[PDB]
Amino acid sequence: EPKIKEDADNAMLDSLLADPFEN
Amino acid sequence: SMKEKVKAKLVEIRKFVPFIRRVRIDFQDTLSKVQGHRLDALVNLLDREDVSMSSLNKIEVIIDKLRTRFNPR
C-alpha cells in the first residue's frame, strides 16, 4: 500500500521542514 | 510523464547528498541526536526511486536551509 509509505516519507520531511536548525 | 519528471528531479537533487552526509558528521557534536537521525533518513530516502514529487519539493526546501545554516554562502 502506497499511502502508508507516502505518509511515512512526508511526516519525516515535515520534521526537517519545521526544524530551523537554529545554529 | 510526471514520473519521467520525478526521476529527473531525483537524479539532480542527489548531487547534494555528499553535503548532507558531510554536515551530519562535521557537526555531529552541535547537532541534536534526532537531527542526526533525520539527515540519515533523508540520505536513504534519496536512494529510492518511488519518491513523490511533493516529497521532492520539500527536500528542495530542506536542502536550501541546510546550505544556509552550515558553511553558508
Q: What secondary structure, in 3-state letters, does chain B show?
A: CHHHHHHHHHHHHHHHHHHHHHHHHHCCCCCCHHHHHHHHHHHHHCCCCCCCHHHHHHHHHHHHHHHHHCCCC
Nearest to B38 among A5, A6, A16 (CB): A16
Question: Cell triple for residue B18?
Answer: 555528499
Q: Which domain holds residue B36?
A: 2-69
| Measured distance CA(B27)–CA(B63) in Å, rounded | 16
Q: How was this structure determined?
A: X-ray
| Measured distance CA(B32)–CA(B18) in Å, rounded | 20
Tell me, rounded to whole angstroms, the distance of Cα A3 from its chain centroid.
14
Identify whether the C-beta of residue A12 lies closer than 8 Å to the C-beta of residue B45: yes
Chain A, chain B: beta-carbon pairs less than 8 Å apart: 44
Q: Which chain B residues in 50-69 lie under 8 Å from chain A, judged by CB atoms?
A: 50-52, 54-55, 58-59, 61-62, 65-66, 69
Split into its structural domains, chain B has a count of: 1
Question: Cell triple for residue B72?
Answer: 553558508
Position B2, amino acid: M
DSSP state of A11: H
Contacts 24+ apart (CB under 8 A), B37-42: B38/A12, B38/A15, B38/A16, B38/A19, B39/A16, B41/A12, B42/A12, B42/A13, B42/A16
Question: Cell triple for residue B31?
Answer: 547537532
Resolution (A): 2.5
Q: What is the CB neighbour count within 10 angstroms for residue B12? A: 11
